[PDB]
Scaffold this active site. Structure first.
Site, PDB file in Angstrom:
ATOM      1  N   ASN A 121      32.481  35.014  65.776  1.00  0.00           N
ATOM      2  CA  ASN A 121      33.180  35.679  64.350  1.00  0.00           C
ATOM      3  C   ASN A 121      33.031  37.206  64.598  1.00  0.00           C
ATOM      4  O   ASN A 121      34.232  37.807  64.126  1.00  0.00           O
ATOM      5  CB  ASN A 121      32.398  35.310  63.211  1.00  0.00           C
ATOM      6  CG  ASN A 121      32.484  33.823  62.819  1.00  0.00           C
ATOM      7  OD1 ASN A 121      31.861  33.181  62.233  1.00  0.00           O
ATOM      8  ND2 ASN A 121      33.729  33.302  63.191  1.00  0.00           N
ATOM      9  N   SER A 167      32.179  24.399  63.779  1.00  0.00           N
ATOM     10  CA  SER A 167      31.439  25.448  63.764  1.00  0.00           C
ATOM     11  C   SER A 167      30.054  25.211  64.180  1.00  0.00           C
ATOM     12  O   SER A 167      29.415  24.236  63.671  1.00  0.00           O
ATOM     13  CB  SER A 167      31.256  26.342  62.409  1.00  0.00           C
ATOM     14  OG  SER A 167      32.465  26.766  62.173  1.00  0.00           O
ATOM     15  N   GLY A 181      24.538  22.365  60.379  1.00  0.00           N
ATOM     16  CA  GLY A 181      23.897  21.136  60.732  1.00  0.00           C
ATOM     17  C   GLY A 181      24.886  20.114  61.008  1.00  0.00           C
ATOM     18  O   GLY A 181      24.816  19.469  62.147  1.00  0.00           O
ATOM     19  N   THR A 182      25.658  19.704  60.049  1.00  0.00           N
ATOM     20  CA  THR A 182      26.706  18.631  60.254  1.00  0.00           C
ATOM     21  C   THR A 182      27.738  19.016  61.176  1.00  0.00           C
ATOM     22  O   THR A 182      28.553  18.059  61.883  1.00  0.00           O
ATOM     23  CB  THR A 182      27.423  18.129  58.864  1.00  0.00           C
ATOM     24  OG1 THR A 182      28.399  17.311  58.907  1.00  0.00           O
ATOM     25  CG2 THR A 182      28.145  19.561  58.451  1.00  0.00           C
ATOM     26  N   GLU A 199      29.677  16.819  52.534  1.00  0.00           N
ATOM     27  CA  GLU A 199      29.788  17.401  51.297  1.00  0.00           C
ATOM     28  C   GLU A 199      31.024  17.505  50.779  1.00  0.00           C
ATOM     29  O   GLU A 199      31.917  18.081  51.450  1.00  0.00           O
ATOM     30  CB  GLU A 199      28.766  18.703  51.351  1.00  0.00           C
ATOM     31  CG  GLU A 199      28.929  19.396  49.823  1.00  0.00           C
ATOM     32  CD  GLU A 199      28.309  20.860  49.897  1.00  0.00           C
ATOM     33  OE1 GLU A 199      29.179  21.757  50.079  1.00  0.00           O
ATOM     34  OE2 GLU A 199      27.239  21.042  49.876  1.00  0.00           O
ATOM     35  N   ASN A 258      41.109  32.830  60.350  1.00  0.00           N
ATOM     36  CA  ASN A 258      41.631  31.479  60.499  1.00  0.00           C
ATOM     37  C   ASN A 258      43.169  31.667  60.984  1.00  0.00           C
ATOM     38  O   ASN A 258      43.660  30.635  61.695  1.00  0.00           O
ATOM     39  CB  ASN A 258      41.594  30.440  59.222  1.00  0.00           C
ATOM     40  CG  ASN A 258      40.253  30.512  58.959  1.00  0.00           C
ATOM     41  OD1 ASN A 258      38.992  30.166  59.754  1.00  0.00           O
ATOM     42  ND2 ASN A 258      39.755  30.266  57.403  1.00  0.00           N
ATOM     43  N   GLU A 286      47.718  20.204  82.678  1.00  0.00           N
ATOM     44  CA  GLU A 286      47.777  21.230  83.458  1.00  0.00           C
ATOM     45  C   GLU A 286      46.836  22.346  82.924  1.00  0.00           C
ATOM     46  O   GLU A 286      47.345  23.659  83.125  1.00  0.00           O
ATOM     47  CB  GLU A 286      49.215  21.735  83.813  1.00  0.00           C
ATOM     48  CG  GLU A 286      50.120  20.825  84.490  1.00  0.00           C
ATOM     49  CD  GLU A 286      51.273  20.807  84.308  1.00  0.00           C
ATOM     50  OE1 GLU A 286      52.434  19.885  84.706  1.00  0.00           O
ATOM     51  OE2 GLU A 286      51.821  21.819  83.563  1.00  0.00           O
ATOM     52  N   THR A 346      24.889  34.622  59.703  1.00  0.00           N
ATOM     53  CA  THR A 346      24.480  34.230  58.464  1.00  0.00           C
ATOM     54  C   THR A 346      23.389  33.103  58.097  1.00  0.00           C
ATOM     55  O   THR A 346      22.599  33.751  57.102  1.00  0.00           O
ATOM     56  CB  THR A 346      26.081  33.133  58.001  1.00  0.00           C
ATOM     57  OG1 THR A 346      27.161  33.972  58.329  1.00  0.00           O
ATOM     58  CG2 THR A 346      26.011  32.660  56.582  1.00  0.00           C
ATOM     59  N   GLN A 351      32.629  22.647  57.532  1.00  0.00           N
ATOM     60  CA  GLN A 351      33.252  23.481  56.584  1.00  0.00           C
ATOM     61  C   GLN A 351      34.202  24.361  57.372  1.00  0.00           C
ATOM     62  O   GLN A 351      35.298  24.518  56.887  1.00  0.00           O
ATOM     63  CB  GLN A 351      32.371  24.205  55.550  1.00  0.00           C
ATOM     64  CG  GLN A 351      33.161  25.127  54.640  1.00  0.00           C
ATOM     65  CD  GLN A 351      32.456  26.179  54.138  1.00  0.00           C
ATOM     66  OE1 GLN A 351      32.491  27.246  54.520  1.00  0.00           O
ATOM     67  NE2 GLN A 351      31.159  25.862  53.216  1.00  0.00           N
TER      68      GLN A 351
HETATM   69  N1  LIG Z   1      35.757  31.232  61.393  1.00  0.00           N
HETATM   70  C1  LIG Z   1      34.819  30.663  60.472  1.00  0.00           C
HETATM   71  N2  LIG Z   1      33.844  30.399  60.728  1.00  0.00           N
HETATM   72  C2  LIG Z   1      32.955  30.031  59.742  1.00  0.00           C
HETATM   73  C3  LIG Z   1      33.555  29.888  58.250  1.00  0.00           C
HETATM   74  N3  LIG Z   1      32.872  29.652  57.426  1.00  0.00           N
HETATM   75  C4  LIG Z   1      31.893  29.105  58.066  1.00  0.00           C
HETATM   76  N4  LIG Z   1      31.668  29.384  59.380  1.00  0.00           N
HETATM   77  C5  LIG Z   1      30.811  29.363  60.392  1.00  0.00           C
HETATM   78  O1  LIG Z   1      29.981  28.082  60.062  1.00  0.00           O
HETATM   79  C6  LIG Z   1      28.593  28.662  60.298  1.00  0.00           C
HETATM   80  C7  LIG Z   1      28.010  27.612  59.307  1.00  0.00           C
HETATM   81  O2  LIG Z   1      28.376  26.508  59.258  1.00  0.00           O
HETATM   82  P1  LIG Z   1      29.139  26.129  57.637  1.00  0.00           P
HETATM   83  O3  LIG Z   1      30.647  26.548  57.955  1.00  0.00           O
HETATM   84  O4  LIG Z   1      28.618  27.091  56.621  1.00  0.00           O
HETATM   85  O5  LIG Z   1      29.028  24.627  57.398  1.00  0.00           O
HETATM   86  P2  LIG Z   1      28.677  23.441  58.438  1.00  0.00           P
HETATM   87  O6  LIG Z   1      29.071  23.877  59.660  1.00  0.00           O
HETATM   88  O7  LIG Z   1      29.786  22.451  58.077  1.00  0.00           O
HETATM   89  O8  LIG Z   1      27.170  23.141  58.500  1.00  0.00           O
HETATM   90  P3  LIG Z   1      26.544  22.838  56.813  1.00  0.00           P
HETATM   91  O9  LIG Z   1      26.353  24.143  56.122  1.00  0.00           O
HETATM   92  O10 LIG Z   1      25.100  22.386  57.054  1.00  0.00           O
HETATM   93  O11 LIG Z   1      27.506  21.991  56.312  1.00  0.00           O
HETATM   94  C8  LIG Z   1      28.445  30.066  60.231  1.00  0.00           C
HETATM   95  O12 LIG Z   1      27.367  30.437  61.109  1.00  0.00           O
HETATM   96  C9  LIG Z   1      29.918  30.600  60.329  1.00  0.00           C
HETATM   97  O13 LIG Z   1      29.909  31.151  61.509  1.00  0.00           O
HETATM   98  C10 LIG Z   1      35.168  30.623  58.064  1.00  0.00           C
HETATM   99  O14 LIG Z   1      35.597  30.156  57.152  1.00  0.00           O
HETATM  100  N5  LIG Z   1      35.791  30.928  59.612  1.00  0.00           N
HETATM  101 MG   LIG Z   2      28.502  23.488  55.480  1.00  0.00          MG
END
Ligand SMILES: Nc1nc2c(ncn2[C@@H]2O[C@H](COP(=O)(O)OP(=O)(O)OP(=O)(O)O)[C@@H](O)[C@H]2O)c(=O)[nH]1
Ligand SMILES: [Mg+2]
Ligand SMILES: Nc1nc2c(ncn2[C@@H]2O[C@H](COP(=O)(O)OP(=O)(O)OP(=O)(O)O)[C@@H](O)[C@H]2O)c(=O)[nH]1
Ligand SMILES: Nc1nc2c(ncn2[C@@H]2O[C@H](COP(=O)(O)OP(=O)(O)O)[C@@H](O)[C@H]2O)c(=O)[nH]1
Ligand SMILES: Nc1nc2c(ncn2[C@@H]2O[C@H](COP(=O)(O)OP(=O)(O)O)[C@@H](O)[C@H]2O)c(=O)[nH]1
Ligand SMILES: [Mg+2]
Lengths: 430, 434, 431, 430
Positions: B201, B135, B139-140, B66, B223, B249, B174, B11
């Site tokens: 973050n 990120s 998980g994913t 998802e 972002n 480089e 989070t 995500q």
């Molecule tokens: N910079 C930034 N980081 C984000 C954002 N949204 C989520 N994160 C980071 O993503 C981490 C958690 O993962 P998610 O983005 O919620 O989703 P995911 O990485 O696909 O993992 P799942 O929730 O299992 O699907 C958090 O610890 C955040 O630091 C965002 O909009 N901007």
């Molecule tokens: Mg997610």
């Protein structure tokens, strides 16, 4: 597409569901005839989670209403939004259980439950990709507490990898309604701890306290209590239906809240809740929402979390808000209340944001917390149960149709083992 | 005739990819529907691909298990830009579980994703490398990202891969299990990525609040900064410059040893229009804000360690002679100290395209900007605190039963801890003097 | 002065046969009535002297509903009235009925209609036969007709477009029986056989065409396109023309091995057709993709014997040669040792046509390939295993024996499949 | 072409046939006076299968009504669509069988069989190309079982290459209307197994359950029971009268369904059947059909199909639909329930599609399944046969018209040998 089915059991479960479906239909803009009359497109893009499509362009809830006496379901069929349910899904007995766990689990459950398993199978695997099951019931009533948990057992056996959720109503002795509550409550807890993935406890005493104190209304009713319960239920699964900054579903919540396999008894609370006279004197903001969330009285249980330690906490925010503010508030609370948070779990609050608030509200929060304070409920119930079972009071009614005292002894042993195991982590140090 | 393929997984990766693709479209002047307006070419060939008549297609693929975030892209204003079959969506999320996204569900998407990667790579002739966004705390993001890197390595070989990971912040967090899946993901990426950037973050919140004067930053604001950083990093490939620097480089100037390729970022100037025009923003002063410790985009203090090397890029109307004086001043300054075996530690690139401003955004319009990417021994602290957190969690085996039952053996956590300890020892022995 | 005669036997052939004729008529601008509103139609049609044109085809079936459907449809005025042969009693999924009981009194009229068409032609290139192989009259009459034509005409080339049963999806329960018995007939009597099982065509429609409920109407349109591409060089001028006789001389290393499977590209719906460029370099990659095989087989499990691909559109000789050399560079595609070069390429100028009410998007380039690979030995094995299970307990046997067929005919048919499989294993091993 | 003649015998058969001819006429748009009044041309293309043309432009069914007394044929003539039947085809006596197989097969059967066989010979001669015969009768009655099975042998002896159907209502003991049912039922099955090409068994008990459970109507009668059977009869030969994607005439059904010559006893089911009050809650597509298709209670037999394994099963779909959806569903069902399907034959389901749905519906399907569980029918009947025959009760009537106890022993052994070889394949392992 990762949808969840609904199964409600007993009089309490049917009363809960009859209001939950009204709340969901109001939220999604479904008329009592089943015709969509919403205002935007976001209300239909994830409508498949709770509803099914029928010919003529109408929607039908995927709910299964099962019970032993037809009076309650006849009452809920004639009420508003009672035409949504498919008439096939109504399954009922002819004799009832009479507040007897033995009758509801052995003598009528075995005969009736085959049909409800057939309909649960049909509804569940007619879906695209099942997400899980959710059940509403009370542990103070015989037919519910027994047949619902036997249903839990069979459903878990047939679907081992699915998510199981239950909203349980635990009987309190301060406001008692049945003299046989300890027996069936202990048996249901013993049968539930082994199978249910997630369980939540609701107390009518706490509901009365909230309705009298916060809402400041003179005469509350079971309608009001069901309304609070319905709002709490919708808050958990709103994120599964609406887009948000941080999406989080039931499996994620369970994984992040359950440290050990047998510790899955949570308590919930909702915010904001303000009286009509003082509704606009307040200001909807994240600090106010989180302080009312973490207020001990606002919780839906008589178990006071200040008497124990929070293993983990969860907060689901609904609306548009700033994630920096949310995280700062969570960190501030976790630092200011270091005593009530067990130390070997740093940063032990999960947070989520959903962009679609409840209808009529701009900001709302659903809270789920696992704290070591719930052991007091178990201790008190076990004390009452052993006091009654020492003299073999009311024992013949339960032993006349199959059970022996050995199962009651096993239930006491398992209940005490759960209490000891659950209080073990309260005093643990890193 | 030079190309590059960007991979978005998770995500957070998708959210940052949306912003960076909006930025690229605005910079190259293509409408959101893909059609060129009104009626100087090959400036878009690095990121886009011509359809032969009119519209363009980005060289990107979107991944997630998802569909909540993916279906938003297919419905929003950019529904006509991306090819319909490169926005790949699953059905069940990993639910913050590394095991689910690496052994149970992630093995059903990876084949289709690699087929899409082949269908994108066979249409390019000068691919400098891959860009992968993820990120790490999800998980994913951790699972599919690790599997993707593992498969791409064996399937391609020496092609460069750049990972703009986002480690969890020191105290702001989070989720609660995110220390667990960070260790395994770090162990996986260490021997499979070529250059990694740290973009936690918490630091970006401080930068926003201090400079842009935002008292409530949101994920949308963060972002945009990362998108601007990517644009600055990759502008030397697709815009004419006085001293050009290619992707290749970097792996000849920034990583002294193969195991040491974790590095930080800093951007300057970041300023709002209300105070943008009260100073001249000369190149002499913007380079000081780049090395200012509180301006680093990662929550790591370079003052606690030595500097290994520094590759930093300029864009605007900067003059090469002006850069040299500022570099000499920085080297003269005593608060910043380098390792003894690195006498010269600066790689400078100069480009002519000024930083494009996004309408409705936050940053103002400035004639000059600098993006700095540094490698330093100070990065050892971020792993040590995460190691302590993981040890505290794993002392009595909490949350582990949610991973063992999904195919991962009990002993996997032990190996990753050894890898982290060896990595810390490697930084310590590299940073020690002779 | 070059002609080909098409034979459509059984319901499966007829319905596929129909879809071929909307495409052939549309290409040459012939209205359904048959009147045009230079001599390129001579391959399929024939001038009547003044005005209309009649197809060079004959429809054979024993069950009247499908034939009567054609005789009352929009094409009632096109076909010759007495070349639509219709029976009274259906074969009813029985191979013995269509080969021993019914077919003895049927072929005599059928060969008369074939003779009348053949004498009209002067440069007869060959015959095309269509029949689903897992049916009664499909294989029962097909085996009889092919045997009779093998002695009446001799050296003429006969091309077979069969539809073998899918590995696990089927509409009949006795089709593993009548499939095996048909193999012993078409193995020694057909010059070219094509693998066109139904399950693979379902997957293409779902994935590429964005169709969620494909139907037999959709499938036959795809098969009709392959026929047009195969014979496009006979009636349209191009840079590299390939005749019908230039398939067996280039794709058949040994007389026994003549089973090939086809692929077509591009197949893209209009929703995402020109959201990409569709270069000539990429269409030849899609042809070799194992998912685009029109038959449910995996080419990655075996070597390639020979490959023949036909390009139509606005391609140029530079780009095929560049693309082919790229394929040889690929490691996942490996050819047999004793065949250094295995590609036969043809280029045509006429772009593929679009049928109204269809699904395929109109494109300026297309490629259709007929590939001979050792991987096709799998389909014979899986059908052989199915036949072994049922014949173990002599199920359904009494139906066949009662219709004049001998008991031991199954045994000699089973041995042929075992003999056929060992041929493929023997060829594939390197020297 | 490929037309079939309809011959019905007995009271039960005549009532079944009378309703059947009413159903067919509405499909082809024939008025009760034999004048065509349809709207689509497809209704008149294949009318020669069932109807015969007469001067003046009216149509007459090629049906032969045979019985022993004028009581029932007085009723059929006065009913709706009774004017269609030709007066020359009413062949009957004056005495009556009296529920005695001996009287209905040896004494009164011999003298009347010449007239009924003469009119049958005339009708089979008149048609262009005969397809076969279909017969409706009951196995418990005298006239239906007696002359019904006797006319089978005479017709089979003259037309050995044609097909034969029997729609037989076997006597269930739960709802028994005759005390001597086991005797004349057992003797009929012995003669039926040797000649009839396809036998289809029906229960009055099962039809009662369908009306009470699925249709959920208040006061069912034989008028409605006949309707359910009549719908199934027309669905079997629908593809023989209308165009379709996969047309499969009756000869094709016999080959696919019969593995061994003596196993030709099928069970029938129809779908969709819905209650009047719940017809707007369901969705009518290909999936919801095959769920009702394979359900146990939708069958028209008392035998439980899940107590045995399906040898082969067939389905016939009516309406406009996609073949891919149909083919995948049959494979999909056969994989989830592999236990109920015999192993030594793969893909034991045949499917067909016809483009003309029944009047009033957009989709319909008829299910014909040859299951090994039909052994429960013969076992239970044989137990009643051996009970009464041991004491020689009711036997003096049968011996009064030429039969002897040797025939009774022979019939029982043949049925007992039928079950032995029919259950033999249930346990067979590949
Ligand atoms: N910079 C930034 N980081 C984000 C954002 N949204 C989520 N994160 C980071 O993503 C981490 C958690 O993962 P998610 O983005 O919620 O989703 P995911 O990485 O696909 O993992 P799942 O929730 O299992 O699907 C958090 O610890 C955040 O630091 C965002 O909009 N901007
Ligand atoms: Mg997610
Ligand atoms: N591609 C394609 N195959 C078809 C079509 N119709 C039927 N088939 C195939 O034909 C096989 C069975 O044969 P039928 O179509 O019933 O007819 P037949 O082959 O002439 O044999 P008979 O039933 O005796 O007439 C099925 O397994 C289908 O796979 C069609 O329209 N298109
Ligand atoms: N919250 C809530 N609780 C209810 C309601 N109705 C009954 N209860 C509780 O349910 C308990 C009795 O449950 P009971 O009717 O015996 O359940 P059953 O045996 O399954 O039918 C009482 O202690 C009540 O407090 C309701 O409408 N709302
Ligand atoms: N379906 C149906 N069955 C009937 C009807 N009338 C009688 N039966 C059945 O037929 C059986 C008796 O058949 P019977 O009248 O003796 O046949 P007959 O001796 O040849 O006239 C009884 O068990 C009834 O259940 C009817 O109208 N419909
Ligand atoms: Mg046919």
């Amino acid at each position: 597409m990762r949808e969840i089915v609904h199964i409600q059991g007993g009089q309490c479960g049917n009363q809960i569901g009859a209001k939950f479906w009204e709340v969901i239909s109001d939220e999604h803009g479904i008329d009592p005839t089943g015709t969509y009359h919403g205002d935007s497109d976001l209300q239909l893009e994830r409508i498949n989670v709770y509803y099914n499509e029928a010919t003529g362009g109408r929607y039908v809830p995927r709910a299964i209403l099962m019970d032993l006496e037809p009076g309650t379901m006849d009452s809920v069929r004639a009420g508003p939004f009672g035409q949504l349910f498919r008439p096939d899904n109504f399954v009922f007995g002819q004799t009832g259980a009479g507040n007897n766990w033995a009758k509801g689990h052995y003598t009528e459950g075995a005969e009736l439950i085959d049909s409800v398993l057939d309909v649960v199978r049909k509804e569940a695997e007619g879906c695209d990709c099942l997400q899980g099951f959710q059940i509403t019931h009370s542990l103070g009533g015989g037919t519910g507490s027994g047949m619902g948990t036997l249903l839990i057992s069979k459903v878990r056996e047939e679907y081992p990898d699915r998510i199981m959720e239950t909203f349980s109503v635990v009987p309190s002795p301060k406001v008692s309604d049945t003299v046989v509550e300890p027996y069936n409550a202990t048996l249901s807890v013993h049968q539930l701890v082994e199978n249910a993935d997630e369980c939540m406890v609701i107390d009518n005493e706490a509901l009365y306290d909230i309705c009298f104190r916060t809402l400041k209304l003179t005469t509350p009713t079971y309608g009001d209590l069901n309304h609070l319960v319905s709002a709490a239920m919708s808050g958990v699964t709103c994120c599964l239906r609406f887009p948000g900054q941080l999406n989080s579903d039931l499996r994620k919540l369970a994984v992040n809240l359950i440290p050990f396999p047998r510790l899955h008894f949570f308590m919930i609370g909702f915010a904001p809740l303000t009286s009509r006279g003082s509704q606009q004197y307040r200001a909807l903001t994240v600090p106010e929402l989180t302080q009312q969330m973490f207020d001990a009285k606002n919780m839906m249980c008589a178990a006071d979390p200040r008497h124990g330690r929070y293993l983990t906490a969860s907060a689901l925010f609904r609306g548009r808000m700033s994630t920096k503010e949310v995280d700062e508030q969570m960190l501030n609370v976790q630092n200011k209340n270091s005593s009530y948070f067990v130390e070997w779990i740093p940063n032990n609050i999960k947070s989520s944001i959903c962009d679609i608030p409840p209808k009529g509200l701009k900001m709302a929060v659903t809270f789920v917390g696992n704290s070591t304070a719930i052991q007091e409920m178990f201790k008190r119930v076990a004390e009452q149960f052993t006091a009654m079972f020492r003299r073999k009071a009311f024992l013949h009614w339960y032993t006349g149709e199959g059970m022996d005292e050995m199962e009651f002894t096993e239930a006491e042993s398992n209940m005490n083992d759960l209490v000891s195991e659950y209080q073990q982590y309260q005093d643990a140090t890193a | 005739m030079r190309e590059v393929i960007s991979i978005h997984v998770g995500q957070g990766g998708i959210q940052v990819g949306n912003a960076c693709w909006e930025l690229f479209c605005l910079e190259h002047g293509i409408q959101p529907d893909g059609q060129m307006p009104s009626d100087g070419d090959d400036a878009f060939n690095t990121f886009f691909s011509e359809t032969g008549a009119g519209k363009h297609v980005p060289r990107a693929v979107f991944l997630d298990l998802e569909p909540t975030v993916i279906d938003e892209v297919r419905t929003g204003t950019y529904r006509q830009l991306f090819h319909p079959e490169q926005l790949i969506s699953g059905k069940e999320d990993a639910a913050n579980n590394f095991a689910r996204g690496h052994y149970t569900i992630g093995k059903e998407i990876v084949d289709l994703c690699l087929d899409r990667i082949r269908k994108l790579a066979d249409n390019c002739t000068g691919l400098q490398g891959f860009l992968v966004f993820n990120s790490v705390g999800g998980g994913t993001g951790s699972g599919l990202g690790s599997l993707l890197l593992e498969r791409l390595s064996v399937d391609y070989g020496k092609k460069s891969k750049l990972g703009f990971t986002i480690y969890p912040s020191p105290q702001v967090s989070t989720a609660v299990v995110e220390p667990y899946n960070s260790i395994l993901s770090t162990h996986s990426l260490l021997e499979h990525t070529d250059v990694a950037v740290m973009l936690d973050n918490e630091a970006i919140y401080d930068i926003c609040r201090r400079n842009l004067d935002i008292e409530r930053p949101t994920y949308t604001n963060l972002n945009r900064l990362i998108a601007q950083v990517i644009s600055s990093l990759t502008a030397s490939l697709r815009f004419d410059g006085a001293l050009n620097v290619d992707i290749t480089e970097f792996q000849t100037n920034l990583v002294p040893y193969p195991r040491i390729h974790f590095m930080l970022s800093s951007y300057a100037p970041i300023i709002s229009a209300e105070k943008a025009y009260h100073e001249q923003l000369s190149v002499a002063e913007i380079t000081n804000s780049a090395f200012e410790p509180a301006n680093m985009m990662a929550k790591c203090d370079p003052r606690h360690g030595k500097y290994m090397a520094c590759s930093m890029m300029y864009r605007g109307d900067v003059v090469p002679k002006d850069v040299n004086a500022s570099i000499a001043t920085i080297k003269t300054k005593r608060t910043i100290q380098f390792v003894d075996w690195c006498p010269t530690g600066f790689k400078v690139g100069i480009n002519y395209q000024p930083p494009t401003v996004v309408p409705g955004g936050d940053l103002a319009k400035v004639m000059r900007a600098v993006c700095m990417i540094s490698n330093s021994t100070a990065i050892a602290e971020v792993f040590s605190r995460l190691d302590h957190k993981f040890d505290l969690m794993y002392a009595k085996r909490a949350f582990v039963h949610w991973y063992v039952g999904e195919g991962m053996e009990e002993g996997e956590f032990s190996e990753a801890r050894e890898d982290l300890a060896a990595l810390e020892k490697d930084y310590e022995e590299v940073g020690i003097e002779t």
